[PDB]
Design an enzyme around this catalytic site. Structure first.
Site, PDB file in Angstrom:
ATOM      1  N   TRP A   1      13.586  -0.292   3.448  1.00  0.00           N
ATOM      2  CA  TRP A   1      13.172   0.736   4.407  1.00  0.00           C
ATOM      3  C   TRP A   1      14.327   1.657   4.759  1.00  0.00           C
ATOM      4  CZ3 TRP A   1       8.614   1.831   3.708  1.00  0.00           C
ATOM      5  CH2 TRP A   1       7.646   0.852   3.412  1.00  0.00           C
TER       6      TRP A   1
ATOM      7  N   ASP B   1      14.832   3.059  13.123  1.00  0.00           N
ATOM      8  CA  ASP B   1      13.514   2.596  12.665  1.00  0.00           C
ATOM      9  C   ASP B   1      13.338   1.151  13.139  1.00  0.00           C
ATOM     10  OD1 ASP B   1      11.255   1.713  11.315  1.00  0.00           O
ATOM     11  OD2 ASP B   1      12.019   2.249   9.312  1.00  0.00           O
TER      12      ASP B   1
ATOM     13  N   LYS C   1       2.925  -3.276  13.308  1.00  0.00           N
ATOM     14  CA  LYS C   1       3.569  -4.618  13.280  1.00  0.00           C
ATOM     15  C   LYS C   1       3.481  -5.335  14.601  1.00  0.00           C
ATOM     16  CE  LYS C   1       5.506  -2.766   9.596  1.00  0.00           C
ATOM     17  NZ  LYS C   1       5.150  -1.410   9.182  1.00  0.00           N
TER      18      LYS C   1
HETATM   19 CL   LIG Z   1      13.740  -3.858   4.223  1.00  0.00          CL
HETATM   20 NA    NA Z   2       6.285   1.173   0.204  1.00  0.00          NA
END
Ligand SMILES: [Cl-]
Ligand code: NA
Ligand SMILES: [Cl-]
Ligand code: NA
Ligand code: NA
Lengths: 360, 358
Positions: free
Chosen positions: A102, A172, A196
């Protein structure tokens, strides 16, 4: 019928009270004789829910008054581009700390828009750890420093946050927001897909220091300006009204259970059940994360070979475990244990793991 | 005692909401909510695909078009479209038929050269321009229209034959209110919350070969190619919104599809328009008769004191959402697919009684 142990990584398990409340009033919200889904976003009835969701988040995270809570569409993924669109100006640098996939995705979008830099990275350590803050390479002309608080795919997590004063600190926090108390004033902006730990998919929460982002940006599309949404209180266009409603219900549940400190205690206990099972397994299960960087939200592990991984996951599925397969990009196993995942699901996972090891 | 004339979000079909309520805690025997499923699961993928298939069947979408489910509303499409098609040396050509048309043009202007093919702004957006008026350029990147001008109460009765560049339509407020010849368009988009279900998903029907190539320098999330290649599963979709969309499309299918729904929409619009037309000028519709929307009926009383009195009475009597959009005032009765004919009848009766008591 199979029991359900919902270890889905997002969307994910919801609190039963929040779902039950939604079900009961789905056709008739607040005596309006309409569903929440049928209300205008320009109505008082909806505005009340919108404001309540903000006020609950504010109370629960102790967000200072000079921060505003935005509710946006597009996921955390859209924030990867919206952040540099707004802050990464000519002459400045989007500085990223890489602690997983991410983090990489965020950096990739900034690269399209301006100069970037890697302040620190554990890529060479296979994203098994969070770097020491003393490793951070900072620039005077950083537009911001961006971190990923919980690296969902790799199962690592910041145990605390750097003290950054030279530029805005941005995070994030998709996979750990409101899993524990948070000093919001350490950050210029925090964003999180809701699916989440805050609610269902379809809304992204952005907590922004107002003065940092409430100015129009030249040439940026209207919908992609934070200023648009700040000025309009996240009512510039039609919000994801049901998602925001469900967020309100989830936040009420967090408040009912005692807030961020109470949920932190539950989350620590849940994680310990699983990590102790891994550690006591004499290498039958091996965690990806270094112990000092372990996530309390996503527990990543592997068995000794792929055949065993597959057998374990097939057994888990047969027994009612949902979502335990690792992210497709890395394989292995991932037990996602967000706030609403019950401790008794973790107990069941321990039992499954012990039995599988004994029958192997 | 509540009549829901909200303009978006809006009334939903009772069967779609009842269905959602019934299985909210246990979707398809999974013993979890549809809201708790992973988008990477077969359980969710089946719903995602079913929603597409229902839309494809109900609108008769050809095989060379793909159905996308995106976030951001119709408003994000205002910028995403020109980001993908408005390249250097081309022109984003717009037909202005209302406020939403202007908002779309505004975004294109930030990204490249634009042009006004035709406009009824000088006629107070009371009509759709004759297609013969359209000014088209050899270097158009596209021609953009707004099928139903939600704020002004006007609507295209049919669509122009455009083949020098793709025809793009914001159909937010009338999609699937009637049959559509999808092959007239390069792309159709609609926020779902008028006629397809709840807010939080935007339906985009795209000619695949028009938009399936990566566009240099465009952010990953803002490329149609990203979503086309990934079947709207690039990032986490609005799963509950897509589920609800599925439920609403099943309701449309069950009552007989787009022709059946058009018949119902024509019937219920007539109730309101006849009331306006027989009022000896007491109610005046904004739209020219030949441009009248079947989805949003806009009207005013003779002056603002009477408008206020009428709208206050309406509120007292349980009518929701009749105030005109804040940009134009007056009254607006939004009468999307799911608004029942009995609500339209109640509105007629309110209007007749109010005039009698004035
Ligand atoms: Cl990650
Ligand atoms: Na993805
Ligand atoms: Cl309009
Ligand atoms: Na607007
Ligand atoms: Na341990």
């Amino acid at each position: 019928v199979k029991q359900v142990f919902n270890f889905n990584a997002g969307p994910s398990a919801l609190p039963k009270p929040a779902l039950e409340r939604a079900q009961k009033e789905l056709l008739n919200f607040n005596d309006t004789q309409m569903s929440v889904m049928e209300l205008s976003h320009r109505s008082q009835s909806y505005e009340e829910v919108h404001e309540q969701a903000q006020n609950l988040l504010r109370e629960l995270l102790q967000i200072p008054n000079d921060y505003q809570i935005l509710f946006l569409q597009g996921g955390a993924s859209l924030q990867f581009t919206m952040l540099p669109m707004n802050l990464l100006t000519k002459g400045t640098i989007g500085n990223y700390v890489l602690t997983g996939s991410w983090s990489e995705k965020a950096l990739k979008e900034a690269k399209l828009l301006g100069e970037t830099h890697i302040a620190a990275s554990t890529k060479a350590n296979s994203y098994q750890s969070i770097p020491d803050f003393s490793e951070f390479q900072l620039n005077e002309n950083d537009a911001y420093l961006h971190i990923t608080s919980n690296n969902t795919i790799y199962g690592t997590q910041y145990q605390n946050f750097p003290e950054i004063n030279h530029a805005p600190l941005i995070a994030d926090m998709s996979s750990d927001i409101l899993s524990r108390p948070l000093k919001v004033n350490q950050f210029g902006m925090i964003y999180a897909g809701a699916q989440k730990n805050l609610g269902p998919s379809g809304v992204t929460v952005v907590i922004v220091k107002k003065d940092l982002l409430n100015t129009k940006v030249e040439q940026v599309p209207t919908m992609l300006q934070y200023a648009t949404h700040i000025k309009s209180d996240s009512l510039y266009n039609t919000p994801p009204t049901f998602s925001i409603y469900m967020l309100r219900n989830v936040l009420d549940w967090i408040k009912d259970l005692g807030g961020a400190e109470a949920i932190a205690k539950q989350n620590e206990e849940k994680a310990k059940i699983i990590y102790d099972t891994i550690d006591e397994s004499n290498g039958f299960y091996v965690g990806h994360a270094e112990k000092g960087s372990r996530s309390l939200m996503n527990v990543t592990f592997n068995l000794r070979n792929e055949e065993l991984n597959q057998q374990f996951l097939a057994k888990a599925k047969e027994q009612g475990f949902v979502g335990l397969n690792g992210h497709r990009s890395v394989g292995g196993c991932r037990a996602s244990i967000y706030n609403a995942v019950p401790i008794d699901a973790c107990i069941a996972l321990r039992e499954l793991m012990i039995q599988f090891k004994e029958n192997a």
